[PDB]
Amino acid sequence: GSHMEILWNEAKAFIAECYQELGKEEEVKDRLDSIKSEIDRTGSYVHTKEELEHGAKMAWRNSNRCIGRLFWNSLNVIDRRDVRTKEDVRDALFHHIETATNNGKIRPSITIFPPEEKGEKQVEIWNHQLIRYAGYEGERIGDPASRSLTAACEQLGWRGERTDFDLLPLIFRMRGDEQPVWYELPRSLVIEVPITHPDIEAFSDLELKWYGVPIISDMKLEVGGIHYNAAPFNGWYMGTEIGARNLADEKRYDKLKKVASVIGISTNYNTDLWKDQALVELNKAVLYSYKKQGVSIVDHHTAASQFKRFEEQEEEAGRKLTGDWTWLIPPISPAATHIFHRSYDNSIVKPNYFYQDKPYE
C-alpha cells in the first residue's frame, strides 16, 4: 500500500536527476513508464548497469561524513546482483578485497549485491568491515570495538588465536537460512602493514600493525527507493583514522602511553603535552609505514586540501554541498585545515549510505 507509493516517488526523483547528469534527459519519459509497469507487476524494479553505477557514485557524493568525496566519479562499481549461493557471495567478497587492494595501489570500489525485495534481505553481511581484528575480554586482548561481533562468530563455531590482531572471518546470512555462515580469510589476500618510524628505531618494539584497506560492509545503500542492504565499499585510509583513533583511543588499542615510552618522553605532566607529542609521532609513523610498503594512504592536510577542491567543484556544477562538521574535521590539528573555519549543512540527500541495525547484540 504505502510501500509501493514511497518506492514510486523516490524513483521519479532519482531517474530525473540521474539522467539529467548523464545527458539522457529525453530518455526519462520512456524509462519511467516501464518502471511504473514493473512496480505494479512485481512490487519493485531493477536498475540498469548505468543507473546503479551512477547511483552508488551520487551516494558517495552525498556522504556528509566523508572527507574523500573529491574522487566520487572514479568509483569502481562491481555488479554482483547475479549471486544466489553462499559460495557466490564468498567469491564476490574475496574478489572485492583483491581488486580493491590492487597490490597496494588501492582502487575505490563497491560490490552491489541483490537488494531487498519485500522488505526482506537476500544477502545480509554481519561484518562491520570485511577486514577487521577480533576483540576479547581478565584484561583486554584485541580490538574492543569488535567484541560483540567476535562473540557472535564464536557462537557459530569460529575460534581465534587470541592475539591482538586476529582476523575476523567473513560472516553473512543467505535468505532462507535462520543463522549465518562463516569463512576464514586467506592470509595472502589481506595486506597488513607493520608500523615503524623514520627516525626512531625503537618504535618497532611496540609491534604495532594495521590492515591496508577499510572495507565498510554493514551500511545500506539507498538508490531510488531500492534498498541495497549489502553493498561493501572502500576508499583508502586517512592516516588519522589509524594513528589518532584505532591505535590511540582509550576504548580502542590505547597505545599513547606506550608510544610516549619508546619516543623517550615522560608521561608525568599534562602540561608537557606528552599525549599530543605521542599522537604526532604515531601518526608520522603510520604515514611512513604505509608509503614504504607501497600501500595507498593520505595525510589529513592533503585530504582536507582535496576536500576544498570538491567544495569548489560542487559550486561550479550548481549542486548544494552537504556535510557533517563533527566528522569532517581531522582528530589531529583540526584548526590547521579549512574545514574547521567554516560551516556545513548537515542535510541528508538521497541517494546515500545509511546505518542499519546490527543482527548480533
Ligand X SMILES: Nc1nc2c(c(=O)[nH]1)N[C@@H](CNc1ccc(C(=O)N[C@@H](CCC(=O)O)C(=O)O)cc1)CN2
Ligand Y SMILES: N=C(NO)NCCC[C@H](N)C(=O)O
Q: Which of 38, 192, 241, 311 is catalytic?
A: 241
C-beta of 109 vs 246, nearer to ligand X: 246
Could you tell me the CA-to-CA distances from 38 to 116, 213, 359 in Å, in that order?
Answer: 16, 39, 31
Q: Is 245 a catalytic residue?
A: no
92 binds its own copies per the rule CB under 8 A = no
Residue 74, number of CB atoms within 10 A of its CB: 11
Least separation in angstroms between CB 331 and its own copies:
4
Residue 197 is which amino acid?
Answer: H
Q: Which of 221, 238, 256, 262 binds ligand Y (CB under 6 A)?
A: 238
Q: Is 98 a catalytic residue?
A: no
Stretch that binds ligand X, among 45-53, 174-182, 196-204, 323-331 (CB under 6 A): 323-331
Collapsed DSSP state (helix, strand, coil) of residue 74: helix
C-beta of 170 vs 297, nearer to its own copies: 297
Phi, psi (rounded to 5 degrees) for 29: -55, -50
144 binds ligand X per the rule CB under 6 A = no
Residue 288, number of CB atoms within 10 A of its CB: 18
Collapsed DSSP state (helix, strand, coil) of residue 94: helix
183 binds ligand HEM per the rule CB under 6 A = no
Q: Is 18 a catalytic residue?
A: no
Outline where the chain has alpha helix (H): 2-21, 28-41, 49-61, 86-101, 147-154, 239-240, 256-262, 274-292, 300-316, 325-328
Residue 10, number of CB atoms within 10 A of its CB: 16
187 binds ligand X per the rule CB under 6 A = no
340 binds ligand HEM per the rule CB under 6 A = no
- Residue pair 165/194 in contact (Cβ under 8 Å)? The answer is no
DSSP label at residue 217 = -
Give, as ranges, the residues between 12 and 41 that touch its own copies (CB under 8 A). Answer: none
C-beta of 142 vs 235, nearer to ligand HEM: 235
* Cβ within 8 Å of residue 34, ≥6 positions away: none
- Residue pair 78/151 in contact (Cβ under 8 Å)? The answer is no
User: From residue 74 to residue 113, what is the string marking binding to ligand Y with x (rule CB under 6 A)?
Assistant: ----------------------------------------
* Cβ within 8 Å of residue 244, ≥6 positions away: 279, 282, 283, 330, 331, 332
CA–chain centroid gap for 91, Å, is: 20
Q: Is 241 a catalytic residue?
A: yes
Residue 120 is which amino acid?
Answer: E
Q: Which of 185, 190, 319, 334 binds its own copies (CB under 8 A)?
A: 334
Give, as ranges, the residues between 230 and 289 that touch its own copies (CB under 8 A). Answer: 244-245, 248-249, 251, 256, 270-273, 275-277, 279-280, 283-284, 287-288
CA–chain centroid gap for 70, Å, is: 16
158 binds ligand X per the rule CB under 6 A = no
Q: Which of 61, 66, 72, 210 is catalytic?
A: 66
Q: Is 66 labelled as part of a ligand binding site?
A: yes
C-beta of 21 vs 241, nearer to ligand Y: 241
249 binds ligand Y per the rule CB under 6 A = no
Q: Which of 233, 253, 288, 290 binds ligand HEM (CB under 6 A)?
A: 233
59 binds ligand Y per the rule CB under 6 A = no
Collapsed DSSP state (helix, strand, coil) of residue 354: strand
User: From residue 117 to residue 156, what is the string marking binding to ligand HEM with x (rule CB under 6 A)?
Assistant: ----------------------------------------
Give, as ranges, the residues between 174 and 233 that touch its own copies (CB under 8 A). Answer: none
- Cα separation, 47 vs 262, whole angstroms: 55
Handedness of CA 108, 153, 86, 3 (dihedral sign): negative
As annotated, the binding site for heme includes 66
Active site residues per annotation = 66, 69, 236, 241
As annotated, the binding site includes 66
**Residues near its own copies (CB under 8 A):** 244-245, 248-249, 251, 256, 270-273, 275-277, 279-280, 283-284, 287-288, 291, 299, 301-302, 305, 325-326, 331-336, 340-341
